[PDB]
Amino acid sequence: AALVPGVTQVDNKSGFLQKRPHRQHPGILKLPHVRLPQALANGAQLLLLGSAGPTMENQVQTLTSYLWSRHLPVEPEELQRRARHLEKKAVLHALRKTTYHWQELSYTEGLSLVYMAARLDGGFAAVSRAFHEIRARNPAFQPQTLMDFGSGTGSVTWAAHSIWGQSLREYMCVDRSAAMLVLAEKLLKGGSESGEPYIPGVFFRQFLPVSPKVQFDVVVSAFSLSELPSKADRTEVVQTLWRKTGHFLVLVENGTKAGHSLLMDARDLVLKGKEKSPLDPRPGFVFAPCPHELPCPQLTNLACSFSQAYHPIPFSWNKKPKEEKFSMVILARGSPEEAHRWPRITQPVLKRPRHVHCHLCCPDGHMQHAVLTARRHGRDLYRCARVSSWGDLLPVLT
Amino acid sequence: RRMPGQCSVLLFPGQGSQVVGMGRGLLNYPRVRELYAAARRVLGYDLLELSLHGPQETLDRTVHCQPAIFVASLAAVEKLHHLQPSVIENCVAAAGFSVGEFAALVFAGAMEFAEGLYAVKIRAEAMQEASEAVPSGMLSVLGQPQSKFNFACLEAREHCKSLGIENPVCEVSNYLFPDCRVISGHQEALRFLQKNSSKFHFRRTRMLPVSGAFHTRLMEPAVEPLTQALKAVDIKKPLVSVYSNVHAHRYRHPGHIHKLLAQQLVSPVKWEQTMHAIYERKKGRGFPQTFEVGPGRQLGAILKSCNMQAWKSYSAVDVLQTLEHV
RNA sequence: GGACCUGGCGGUGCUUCAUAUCCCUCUAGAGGAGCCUGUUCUGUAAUCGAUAAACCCCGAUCAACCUCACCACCUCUUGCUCAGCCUAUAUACCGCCAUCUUAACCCUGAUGAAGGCUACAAAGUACGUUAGGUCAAGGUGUAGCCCAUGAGGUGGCAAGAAAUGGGCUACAUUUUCUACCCCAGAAAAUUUAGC
Numbered sequence A: 001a002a003l004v005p006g007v008t009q010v011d012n013k014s015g016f017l018q019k020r021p022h023r024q025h026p027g028i029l030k031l032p033h034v035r036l037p038q039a040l041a042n043g044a045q046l047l048l049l050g051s052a053g054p055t056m057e058n059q060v061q062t063l064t065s066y067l068w069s070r071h072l073p074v075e076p077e078e079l080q081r082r083a084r085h086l087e088k089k090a091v092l093h094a095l096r097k098t099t100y101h102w103q104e105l106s107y108t109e110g111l112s113l114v115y116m117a118a119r120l121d122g123g124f125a126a127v128s129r130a131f132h133e134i135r136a137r138n139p140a141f142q143p144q145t146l147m148d149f150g151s152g153t154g155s156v157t158w159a160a161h162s163i164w165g166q167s168l169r170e171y172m173c174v175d176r177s178a179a180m181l182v183l184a185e186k187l188l189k190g191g192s193e194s195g196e197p198y199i200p201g202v203f204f205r206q207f208l209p210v211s212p213k214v215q216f217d218v219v220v221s222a223f224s225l226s227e228l229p230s231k232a233d234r235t236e237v238v239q240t241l242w243r244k245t246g247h248f249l250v251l252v253e254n255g256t257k258a259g260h261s262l263l264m265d266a267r268d269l270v271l272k273g274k275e276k277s278p279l280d281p282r283p284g285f286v287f288a289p290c291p292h293e294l295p296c297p298q299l300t301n302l303a304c305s306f307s308q309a310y311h312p313i314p315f316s317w318n319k320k321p322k323e324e325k326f327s328m329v330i331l332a333r334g335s336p337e338e339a340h341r342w343p344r345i346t347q348p349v350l351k352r353p354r355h356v357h358c359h360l361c362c363p364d365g366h367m368q369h370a371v372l373t374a375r376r377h378g379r380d381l382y383r384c385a386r387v388s389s390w391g392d393l394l395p396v397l398t
Numbered sequence B: 001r002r003m004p005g006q007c008s009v010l011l012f013p014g015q016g017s018q019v020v021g022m023g024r025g026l027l028n029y030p031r032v033r034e035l036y037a038a039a040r041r042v043l044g045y046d047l048l049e050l051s052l053h054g055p056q057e058t059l060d061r062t063v064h065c066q067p068a069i070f071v072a073s074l075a076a077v078e079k080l081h082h083l084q085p086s087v088i089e090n091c092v093a094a095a096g097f098s099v100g101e102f103a104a105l106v107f108a109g110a111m112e113f114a115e116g117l118y119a120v121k122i123r124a125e126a127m128q129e130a131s132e133a134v135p136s137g138m139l140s141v142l143g144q145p146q147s148k149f150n151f152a153c154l155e156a157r158e159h160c161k162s163l164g165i166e167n168p169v170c171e172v173s174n175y176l177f178p179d180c181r182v183i184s185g186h187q188e189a190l191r192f193l194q195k196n197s198s199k200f201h202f203r204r205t206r207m208l209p210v211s212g213a214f215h216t217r218l219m220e221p222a223v224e225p226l227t228q229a230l231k232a233v234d235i236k237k238p239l240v241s242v243y244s245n246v247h248a249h250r251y252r253h254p255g256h257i258h259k260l261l262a263q264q265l266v267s268p269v270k271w272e273q274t275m276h277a278i279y280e281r282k283k284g285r286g287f288p289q290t291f292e293v294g295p296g297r298q299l300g301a302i303l304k305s306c307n308m309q310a311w312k313s314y315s316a317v318d319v320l321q322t323l324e325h326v
Numbered sequence C: 001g002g003a004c005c006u007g008g009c010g011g012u013g014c015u016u017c018a019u020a021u022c023c024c025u026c027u028a029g030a031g032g033a034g035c036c037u038g039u040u041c042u043g044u045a046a047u048c049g050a051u052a053a054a055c056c057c058c059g060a061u062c063a064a065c066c067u068c069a070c071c072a073c074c075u076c077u078u079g080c081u082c083a084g085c086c087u088a089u090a091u092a093c094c095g096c097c098a099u100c101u102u103a104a105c106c107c108u109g110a111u112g113a114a115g116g117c118u119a120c121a122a123a124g125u126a127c128g129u130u131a132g133g134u135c136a137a138g139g140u141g142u143a144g145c146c147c148a149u150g151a152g153g154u155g156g157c158a159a160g161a162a163a164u165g166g167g168c169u170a171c172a173u174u175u176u177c178u179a180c181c182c183c184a185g186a187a188a189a190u191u192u193a194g195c
């Protein structure tokens, strides 16, 4: 409960309410409809000129739905418990049913083309929103080094360029798939096998460097940890990425229960330090979206996700703007900047006559369903909530 | 709710439709002679003789053409009422081009002949004075798909800036039909368009025989007089849907006609939008009858260019001759 | 350490053809004008926001002084009726749609790992899942505010600019009107299919 009617008031630092309207309150983190850089869209369409017919539309739709509804691989112990329950109540067949068949996706050339056509714009939108979080809240940050695990098509690289190109000088892109690496190189070279890179300093590797000595300013993993075959693999990858994180570790997955569970495991892993004497002793905290380091109040039954609207790459099947629903967690080195941390709106805000419904993740670690009205909460706080939206912050104190 | 085809739309012409011989074929018809008698009483000169037999140079003057067109349009309305009462009874819309609005409103029971004629007169002398203030003119330009109008107006303006003049005027004045426009403003800009139509991609160009650049800000001096002439007038609610030219939509309440009729004087005429608002409909639906009450047949050609299917049911009231001597 | 066996490269290229899906080539139409929508930027204290709830009834329509929504001020309230509110929730269930997941025998090798074909024939034969949508032709619950998320009043609010995405109208000489239903008279770049 971060909104007590009649007690909580808007947080006015830097002389807010006097010097600037309500629509521009500092928790406004909404990003306008994302449009890809023209070079990237041109390269994608050129690379798909070969085969973009009716079959490709079906393949893209199938791949998108398959990835969206994919579950985490089931760990041994859960299968053991289910097997015991079924036996107490043939068992193997009943386990083939009511259990998800998780399979490795082998990204060959054809499946890489399909994945690019199906997910480039969506991934770019999600990563751009996650990066806008850091840019908006810490505008003095000028990263010089970026690593991106599971760099599929380079959407992370392109978003990082679009935001921090005047400071970034090294883009490490790790991906075990040679086809995916080749496609990323072609996309960076304007869709042609021979050309000059659009972004300078991009390094492509097939193996993840494992060494605490080398440390990047921004480490990213977008829709990548869900490809790993087991929780042990996810754990080791997240540990490596945190060890090599210099300032910010950005994890982005689908906006589903599976993606949110994966990200909450990663968040707990990073927050609970196990290493006895690490080379980098700085502690880690959650920069966004959580205003606390306590266990997620919403991991029990629901999930937590955020939406970013964007314009898809023009195709025979992409006509209208789309929404990208994604789960994010940003872990920052050091300690929280201050103690005036603000609730996060984790659900669409519903505007109704003279009241506003907002679901808040409060700094105390609990969810609050707040119906804000002028008479109860104050005109200024009501106006701030009225202009706020999904994924923003509400500037409230005491 | 009656099927369209038994309804009627009355179109009232504007300046440029004057001709020597208006009225002949209307005089013997009922009730026209006292309209021309009232025209004499209000104007101060015999409009009847000037319209019937004139040099055409006296008739082409701005002060004289507009009252002639107004009175002739109303007389043609009377003739149409005599021949076909059902057409006047089943009227759905009305629209005038520039001065025809003053006729259309009078036809709609929103203004009376005397006050409307006084307003038209004052408008005419005011516009003549505004034209005399500065050289200007109107140029009809027919463009092709590659023609750009705002662009061409722009270079026409830097031309006069290079020559040297305060805020040269050249802007599209009349929207008639697709790719046909009337530009208005200083004569030097119109000379520039006439001479380099080639780079302006204009298929045809024709200088209109008018006194000055109407429907531009050059007529600003004429706004204040006309406004006074309209303050005393008490405009009622039109009985039929009378369409405006400033924005090309129906006049809704009496409290806005007063200022719309003055804004028209310094705003472009939205004739194409008016035709679209009156006639546009799904393919296959029938169109209402259309009657051009007044001199000339220009609105007929404009309607043909705008909407051919609507033009199929178009007819004009003959104001120059009559088949049967009533 | 020696011998042998299965592998693993869902690997890499090169040769020829069957080479159907998929490709191109090819064929016929689709850019202008006027309105309406989608996104951005700028701007306002504020919404160019909606009519089982206006107006216009030739069609359709804009903002209407309808009313609701928003902004700035105020007023009530134990009141309508143990009052009042599409306020929320299908992220409550159920309905409906959609996403994804779902053998045996007989021989050979010394009864080693292991292997089993020849036709003029030589061991081979037999439901669950989803922070999913839908509260408009459908339901059962659960919660909210109840000196205000209820009821009123006084003013405002009625945006501006482009590049591009889409939609509707008219667009003619192989045309248009009349008579006839075919020998008459007057007027004047991608994209969509292909079969």
Ligand SMILES: C[S@@+](CC[C@H](N)C(=O)[O-])C[C@H]1O[C@@H](n2cnc3c(N)ncnc32)[C@H](O)[C@@H]1O
Pocket (backbone or CB within 6 Å): A107, A115, A123, A149, A150, A151, A152, A153, A154, A155, A156, A174, A175, A176, A177, A180, A206, A207, A208, A221, A222, A223, A224, A227, A228
């Ligand atoms: C499908 S992409 C996800 C989208 C991509 N991260 C982006 O931003 O566009 C994830 C990639 O991670 C790679 N990957 C999976 N496991 C890996 C591993 N253990 N080490 C390195 N790369 C791995 C796969 O090749 C796969 O293509």
Ligand code: SF4
Pocket (backbone or CB within 6 Å): A289, A290, A291, A295, A296, A297, A298, A299, A304, A305, A344, A346, A361
């Ligand atoms: S519900 Fe709150 S604590 Fe949980 S992931 Fe979302 S922001 Fe973080």
Ligand SMILES: [Mg+2]
Pocket (backbone or CB within 6 Å): A353
């Ligand atoms: Mg209400």
Ligand SMILES: [Mg+2]
Pocket (backbone or CB within 6 Å): C086
């Ligand atoms: Mg509602």
Ligand SMILES: [Mg+2]
Pocket (backbone or CB within 6 Å): C132
């Ligand atoms: Mg749902």
Ligand SMILES: [Mg+2]
Pocket (backbone or CB within 6 Å): C157, C158
């Ligand atoms: Mg409004």
